[PDB]
DNA sequence: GAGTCCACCGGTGGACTC
DNA sequence: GAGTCCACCGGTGGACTC
């Protein structure tokens, strides 16, 4: 459970223990002893919980906490198992923190898309835990759907065939000559549900937990869309990082310029939206950093930043009120 | 020495040796033990030997094992004085590697200037170790000077106080609309030397290895070049990553577009080259990653990134360098 | 199981600032 | 001395394939 449990633990079957042995079981090139099951590990602490839809205690608390409460547990149960042998790697601990941040993250997030929905199918506003009613006026038209994007994707498969036949007729083009544009990905986008999908249900039901079963109907939901988003209609892009460095700060910035060339300069939609979200962001260089404009809006000839906000979440509600009223505001845009 | 030696390291100073004991002077909010001092190690393994200008062994060795010796040595100077209690983290060798990667080849790299400079202006081709002698016509306008550039810098600060006008002039405009264009630094520049130093014989000695004092004479020569490079004398950006990673391939991309935007787009500049460096690509994503055009190119057509390199051995780095030059100064007038 | 790729970030040694 | 900032990268868990 989300508070480490003896009891929850030890009923666990073996190959579902957040600590797994493979002392006598190597790996090539590799000298790891323990594994850290990030799956397992979300299936225990947040199996039942996801911050921000969850008890006053969880939805308030600091969000740096419940991020990290993940290893905690584990390492908890690490210890309990193996005492003195027990060794994990602090590259581990990191590997894993950043991908329970970005789940979590989109997962929260994911239940905001679900009540926002129902909310514009007319079934009126959830209230537990309560929220503020968004005044934006119910449509149908003004669904989304959160796409937490997979390792190797590139954001360009998303869209309609023909805005991707556009961008290769530029690609190639480029390619032929030696150059290039590539792509890679966000870590999430928030999309316009296409029309056709505009009375399915799944896209209004809010998660429990971040249960094996919901971990793959979340990180798998961007199959759906592929090829079905019109360039304007990729609303929200997001790159999570748990902490900053100074080098670590440019692949968000890169990727939003290049969508911004491609989707605004190429492809006429309006202003790309695009922010990374941060719990440790150690001083102030990045938020000058990201306050860079658009390269390719600066050189051809209104410009806007390449990068929208840092935002620093303190806890999962404030995520959740921040997601709510972007859209309360962005969607106004759309008829409806 | 560069190979490792009981006998050296007894003849060193407490505070010469390559791991610090630090057990019972923590540093606060740090669980570290023992530290690498990379300063040391330098001078200890590099002391007398810059590769590519030492023995034929050294020179044509792999440059992977070259770049791994300093850490290696340390690392058993710490067994052999604290057996089982010596420990460092990964990130530790890790961090030290990244500025050893990055200090020796740019001492490869100031040698090679210096020898490229003594034949700038009439001296001849030096001969040890033997490299191929450039075609290119001397003439005391083409000495260039090799820029190791310090953590915390920012490359707007080499050009000539005129040029940094146009670029805080406009800077400043974006400011107002709460914009900004911050410039960052690549960890090299290579810059045509400015007509005041064109006799100075500083730029045209061979430093023998990496003693402190050579340290600090090729880490500190930025400063003598501070407000005096026009825009079209940076002749070349390099960024050195030991490794490479699909995420740790950004910023040297991000920070070619902004040199290109702001020098060719904004000071009228050639083509600004701009290369990485690295020692481990871990497959084509980053050569194909390297492949994209420059965007303000676009916005207008040439790449932000002109190659991604992979020096075998120190030798063929400083072959690489000598036959840049060789072109590249053909742009600058005798 | 093994091989290959992808993308995560935290612990660092030294420079600067009082 | 002691505090902050900078920019270094290698060890990871899981996806995909057989
Ligand atoms: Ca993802
Ligand atoms: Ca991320
Ligand atoms: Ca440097
Ligand atoms: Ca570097």
Redesign the pocket.
């Known amino acids: 459970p989300f508070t480490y449990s003896i009891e929850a633990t030890r009923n666990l079957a073996t190959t579902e223990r957040c600590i797994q042995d493979i002392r006598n079981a ?3 090139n ?3 002893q323990f ?6 590990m979300l299936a225990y602490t947040f199996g039942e919980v996801i911050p921000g839809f969850a008890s006053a205690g969880i939805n308030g608390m600091d969000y740096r906490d419940v991020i990290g409460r993940p290893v905690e547990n584990a390492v908890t149960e690490g210890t309990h198992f193996f005492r003195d042998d027990f060794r ?12 329970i ?2 789940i979590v993250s989109s997962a929260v997030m994911w239940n905001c898309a679900a009540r926002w929905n129902s909310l514009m199918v007319g079934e009126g506003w959830r209230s537990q835990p309560r929220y503020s009613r968004p005044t934006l006026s119910p449509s149908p038209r003004r669904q989304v759907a959160v796409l937490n994007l ?4 590139d954001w360009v498969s998303l869209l309609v065939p023909e805005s991707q036949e556009v961008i290769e007729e530029f690609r190639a083009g480029l390619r032929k000559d030696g150059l290039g544009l590539p792509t ?2 966000p ?1 999430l986008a928030v999309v316009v549900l296409p029309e056709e999908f505009q009375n399915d249900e799944m896209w209004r039901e809010e998660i429990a937990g971040l249960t094996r079963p919901n971990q793959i109907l979340l ?1 798998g939901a961007y199959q759906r869309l592929q090829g079905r988003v019109q360039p304007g209609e990729i609303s929200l892009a997001v ?5 900053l ?4 700060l440019y ?1 968000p910035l890169y990727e939003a310029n290049v969508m911004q060339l491609l989707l605004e300069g190429k492809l006429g939609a309006p202003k790309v939206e695009f922010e990374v979200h941060t719990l ?1 962001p ?4 990045a938020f000058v950093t990201y306050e860079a404009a658009s390269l390719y809006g600066l050189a051809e000839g209104a410009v806007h930043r390449a990068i929208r906000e840092l935002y620093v979440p303190p806890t999962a509600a404030d995520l959740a009120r921040r997601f709510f009223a972007f859209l309360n505001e962005r969607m106004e845009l759309v008829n409806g």
Do not use: W
Request: glycine letters at 4%; a positive charge.
């Open positions: 190597p790996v090539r590799r000298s790891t594994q850290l099951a990030q799956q397992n994990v790697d602090s590259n581990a601990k990191a590997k894993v923190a950043g991908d941040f970005e997979p390792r190797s994707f890679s990905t870590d990180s790159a999570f990082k748990r902490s460095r100074s080098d670590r692949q440790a150690e001083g102030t260089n």
